[PDB]
């Protein structure tokens, strides 16, 4: 529980502990505040309970969309924006960490999809989505694929579906309209059609997994694949003439990858809300603070412009940073969880031939607004 002179943070154990703890130690060193980092397996169940008990964790780590649900669950207090930091960071990142016009988190790091290709097979990737299928046919002759997906999550499909003018929710006047989706939109039909053509014409395998395809990429069996800046895939800092670039764009359209932003929320019920608030912004994402914490991660791919500039010198990052500024911010709205389910079902039924595109997308928007 929360103690006087203490703060408790829960962050994905997979790689959560090392950086956060060392940063907590720095803040613990300065103020004497005892920091405690734990691994969040229980959080989903604890979330409602700790709030009801007026005392659980102080700070909650960001998921994908779920953090927005956490805001709706009142797991975070209203936060005050730092104008100086805004300049030091990026503008587009702030939308992801704001909800109902209020600041619910700080942007620490930026994740976006990018095209990862073998320079030896393809020295020049496609500039647009139209070029891919023609490009794929040529390298299909060599037993390569141009584009990778496994249709195990809607995350994979979105790049194709939204590319033609699709979108989760409409934003206007600083507010999202729950009644205005771009998932039942004509553009969404075109994007999903692209997916079907890729599978039907055997440009990509419907059953092949991301781990299998990434392994095939690692061996040069597949020319190109899609992943974020982490390049964890199934390999470590590769050296064999692999490269990273931005995703294709079609006829001047919003054809670019979605953007996720690392976020943190501060328990409103916490007696130590001020301790959490001050250190969060001043350590987790600053010139001094971010530098220390990134030491545990490979690249960082960070929301901090200054530190980003230096690490952005890697081909792996530079494309992700560019397409982050040109990509589309992933909504933090709780209904995004329904958007996840809504797309996944719609795509599978379409690809399996069980349901038509317009009908599946009609079901997709129905689920979101229901």
Curated annotation (Swiss-Prot):
NCBIfam families: PRK09474.1 (NF007011). It comes from the Bacteria. GO terms for molecular function: carbohydrate transmembrane transporter activity; maltose binding. This is Maltose/maltodextrin-binding periplasmic protein. The keyword Transport applies. Belongs to the bacterial solute-binding protein 1 family. InterPro entries: Maltose/Cyclodextrin-bd, SBP, SBP_1_CS. Its main location: periplasm. Pfam families: SBP_bac_1. Keywords: Periplasm, Signal, Sugar transport, Transport. The complex is composed of two ATP-binding proteins (MalK), two transmembrane proteins (MalG and MalF) and a solute-binding protein (MalE). Induction: Induced by maltose and the transcriptional regulator MalT. Permanently repressed by cold shock in a PNPase-dependent fashion. One of its GO terms (biological process) is cell chemotaxis. PANTHER family: MALTOSE-BINDING PERIPLASMIC PROTEIN, MALTOSE_MALTODEXTRIN-BINDING PERIPLASMIC PROTEIN. GO terms for cellular component: ATP-binding cassette (ABC) transporter complex; ATP-binding cassette (ABC) transporter complex, substrate-binding subunit-containing; maltose transport complex; membrane; outer membrane-bounded periplasmic space; periplasmic space. It is found in: Periplasm. Part of the ABC transporter complex MalEFGK involved in maltose/maltodextrin import. Binds maltose and higher maltodextrins such as maltotriose.
């Amino acid at each position: 529980k929360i103690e006087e002179g203490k703060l408790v943070i829960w962050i994905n154990g997979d790689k959560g502990y090392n950086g956060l703890a060392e940063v907590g130690k720095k803040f613990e060193k300065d103020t004497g505040i005892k920091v405690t980092v734990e691994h969040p397996d229980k959080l989903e169940e604890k979330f409602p309970q700790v709030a009801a008990t007026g005392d659980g964790p102080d700070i909650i780590f960001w998921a994908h969309d779920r953090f927005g649900g956490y805001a709706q669950s009142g797991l975070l207090a209203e936060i005050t924006p730092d104008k100086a930091f805004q300049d030091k960071l990026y503008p587009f990142t702030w939308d992801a960490v704001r909800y109902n016009g209020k600041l619910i988190a700080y942007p620490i790091a930026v994740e976006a999809l990018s095209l990862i290709y073998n320079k030896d097979l393809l020295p020049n990737p496609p500039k647009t989505w139209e070029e891919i299928p023609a490009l794929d046919k040529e390298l299909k002759a060599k037993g390569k694929s141009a584009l990778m997906f496994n249709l195990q999550e809607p995350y994979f499909t979105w790049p194709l579906i939204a590319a033609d003018g699709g979108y989760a929710f409409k934003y206007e006047n600083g507010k999202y309209d729950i009644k205005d989706v771009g998932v039942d939109n004509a553009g969404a039909k075109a994007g999903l059609t692209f997916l079907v053509d890729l599978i039907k014409n055997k440009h990509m395998n419907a059953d092949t997994d991301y781990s299998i395809a990434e392994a095939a990429f690692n061996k040069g069996e597949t020319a190109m694949t899609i992943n974020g800046p982490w390049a964890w895939s199934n390999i470590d800092t590769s050296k064999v003439n692999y490269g990273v670039t931005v995703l294709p764009t079609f006829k001047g359209q919003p054809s670019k990858p979605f953007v996720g932003v690392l976020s943190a929320g501060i328990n409103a019920a916490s007696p130590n809300k001020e301790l959490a608030k001050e250190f969060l912004e001043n350590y987790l994402l600053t010139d001094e603070g971010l530098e220390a914490v990134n030491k545990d991660k490979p690249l960082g791919a960070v929301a901090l412009k200054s530190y980003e500039e230096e690490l952005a010198k890697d081909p792996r990052i530079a494309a992700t940073m560019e397409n982050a500024q040109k990509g589309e911010i992933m909504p933090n709205i709780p209904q995004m969880s329904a958007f996840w389910y809504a797309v996944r079902t719609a795509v599978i039924n379409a690809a399996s031939g069980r349901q038509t595109v317009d009908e599946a997308l009609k079901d997709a928007q129905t689920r979101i607004t229901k």
